[PDB]
Amino acid sequence: SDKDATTDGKNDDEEEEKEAGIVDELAYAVLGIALIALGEDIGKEMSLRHFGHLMHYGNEHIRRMVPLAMGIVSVSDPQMKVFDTLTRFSHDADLEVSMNSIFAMGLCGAGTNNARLAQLLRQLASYYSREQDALFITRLAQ
């Protein structure tokens, strides 16, 4: 509950108060992941997944850099359910952002098999991001 709440506070606050603060709240999460890995082993499993949805809820303005940067590192870390949650943000306009996700995620997926359970999550995520020349967009906001 604690890990989901810390993130959930940041997302909820940042839309409603103004919108230029949205960019700043992204940095807390990056540091939060580093803190949570030496603080609790179990706590890490939850916070990886919350980060991808931190971005999607708050509607950050930088959708190019951060999912791809997260994604390489998060292959080692347990819980591949992380990639799925990164791609809900990344989807933006389809085949804009989503090209890099497909390219990067197909490498780590093909390259590494370490359980057929782990493989299933990694596959699901790439296919989400794309549609067909930006058929629809997703915004958590109204």
Partner: protein, 372 residues
């Protein structure tokens, strides 16, 4: 994920066995015969009681190879085989002081001993598969007064004798199948220098050439290792070491096969933008093979490169043999077998193993007949 074979985990002081086996199993007849072994395969009977130890060894290869092909496995045991080999030859069964455990020597010797065992079990007809027959003329320098012709001289691999005559493999092969024999015998003269030229009279279907790397220094009285750069072509042509007659036969078949090989290399690239397609070409290739072909013979004078054993580090007295084998499905895709660490490497990595220096360099090269 993708399909990739398994390797051997080195116990330690065992790589001389582990490294060598991999290269051998690439060879298509080799892997086949160990699988299709029966306890009813005809033996080269003249008596002998070690024929029975030879049988046991071939069973151990068969199960190692079954482990290797099947994925329910990530490590292939050499332990049952090690026990059989130590019974068979009691030189591997000694004990080192201040170092430890069971005596460690010699991937060359080991390939020799393994082919010996297989040829007893699978007969002399199997001996011909890697065995090379020569035509040797032993003849005086100037006018001949004493002459002998030897075909009973034979080998199962070439010995490229380095003496600083290597910059290319062919030169050193040519100066170690060319030689001068000095005599210490009474004729009507004595100490006549004879020119000896060995020429290959029967090609093997599978070629092995070993580089000789050792020397006894006599100016310090201690073993050293020769280090030299020798480029080896992936595509090896032995035309100049055959007699004219035999060369004429194999070079004409080779040139037609190179026409079909060219035709494949063009067609392959187009369809890109596999096994069955190779078989459609194989049925075309076999038609240009000569009608006088016999058992234990390459239908060409050309061979392609399927294995390199490399030896790395410092002196001889020391060694950790890693190896390179070529994929059995590909032709420019190579697997690096560093015991159970198996990886894909490219042509460029194979090229780099020419050597000189403390780096990886070649000791044994495995090829096989049929260009492609």
């Amino acid at each position: 994920f993708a399909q990739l074979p398994v390797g051997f985990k080195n116990m330690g002081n065992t790589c001389y066995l582990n490294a060598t086996l991999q290269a051998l199993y690439r060879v298509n007849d080799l892997r086949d015969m160990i699988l299709n072994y029966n306890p009813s395969q005809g033996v080269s009977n003249s008596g002998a009681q070690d024929e029975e130890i030879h049988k046991q060894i071939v069973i151990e290869m068969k199960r190692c190879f079954e482990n290797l092909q099947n994925k329910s496995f990530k490590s292939v045991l050499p332990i049952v085989l090690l026990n059989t080999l130590r019974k068979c030859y009691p030189q591997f069964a000694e004990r080192d002081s201040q170092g430890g455990f069971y005596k460690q020597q010699d991937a060359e010797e080991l390939f020799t001993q393994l082919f010996h065992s297989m040829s007893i079990v699978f007969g002399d007809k199997f001996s011909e598969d890697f065995r090379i027959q020569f035509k040797t003329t032993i003849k005086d320098t100037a006018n001949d007064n004493d002459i002998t012709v030897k075909e009973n001289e034979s080998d199962s691999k070439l010995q490229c004798h380095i003496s600083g005559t290597t910059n290319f493999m062919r030169n050193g092969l040519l100066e170690g199948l060319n030689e001068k024999i000095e005599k210490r015998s009474d004729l009507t003269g004595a100490n006549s220098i004879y020119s000896v030229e060995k020429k290959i009279s029967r090609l093997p279907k599978f070629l092995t050439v070993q580089y000789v790397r050792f020397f006894w220094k006599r100016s310090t009285n201690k073993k050293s290792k020769i280090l030299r750069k020798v480029v080896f072509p992936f595509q090896l042509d032995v035309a100049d070491m055959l007699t004219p007659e035999y060369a004429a036969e194999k070079v004409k078949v080779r040139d037609e096969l190179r026409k079909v090989e060219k035709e494949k290399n063009e067609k392959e690239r187009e369809i890109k933008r596999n096994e069955s397609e190779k078989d459609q070409w194989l049925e075309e290739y076999k038609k240009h093979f000569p009608p006088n072909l016999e058992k234990g013979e390459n239908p060409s004078c050309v061979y392609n490169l399927i294995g390199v054993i490399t030896h790395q580090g410092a002196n001889s007295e020391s060694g950790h043999y890693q190896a390179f084998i070529r994929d059995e499905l590909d032709e420019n895709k190579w697997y690096k077998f560093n015991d159970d660490k198996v990886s894909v490497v490219e042509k460029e990595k194979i090229e780099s193993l020419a050597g000189g220096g403390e780096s990886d360099s070649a000791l044994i090269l495995m090829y096989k007949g049929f260009g492609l």
